[PDB]
Amino acid sequence: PQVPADVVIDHLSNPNAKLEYKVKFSHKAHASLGTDAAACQKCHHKWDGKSEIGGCATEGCHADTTSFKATEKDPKFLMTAFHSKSPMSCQGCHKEMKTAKKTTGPTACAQCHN
Numbered sequence: 001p002q003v004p005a006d007v008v009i010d011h012l013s014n015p016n017a018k019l020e021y022k023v024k025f026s027h028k029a030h031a032s033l034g035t036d037a038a039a040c041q042k043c044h045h046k047w048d049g050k051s052e053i054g055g056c057a058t059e060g061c062h063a064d065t066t067s068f069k070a071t072e073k074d075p076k077f078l079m080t081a082f083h084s085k086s087p088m089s090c091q092g093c094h095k096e097m098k099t100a101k102k103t104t105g106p107t108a109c110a111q112c113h114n
Ligand code: HEC
Pocket: 009, 010, 011, 012, 013, 014, 015, 019, 020, 021, 022, 023, 068, 069, 070, 082, 083, 090, 091, 094, 105, 106, 107, 108, 109, 110, 112, 113
């Protein structure tokens, strides 16, 4: 399927405004992960490899936007999908790849959020 242009991820609206973030994400920058269907499945992990690809926060997925904890572990929350220790999350993949210092994205909170 079509690989999107750069976006700003902004699904969450932390009532503590100092901890509200709008986070740039580039499919193109992530091309080193691959461009085949399996590459897409490294993140779109429930995708069947054939259908339309959609967002992470639909019904039955990571739809709950009411936890604002970076340490959230319940997968029903969107925070978990971007932060958990799993290699499918933003923070989790970058940090797992950093285990033997493979080239990867930002691991620090502020460097990723900007
Ligand atoms: C290091 C420990 C942290 C901490 C404390 C937080 N983050 Fe992140 N973050 C990332 C993405 C893609 C989002 C989604 C933004 C959105 O959809 O609006 C967030 C969001 C947050 C929040 C909520 C922000 C809000 O607008 O409500 C909070 C409180 C938060 N984070 C804390 C992405 C990343 C990273 C990318 C690799 C990394 C690293 C971090 N976050 C790290 C941290």
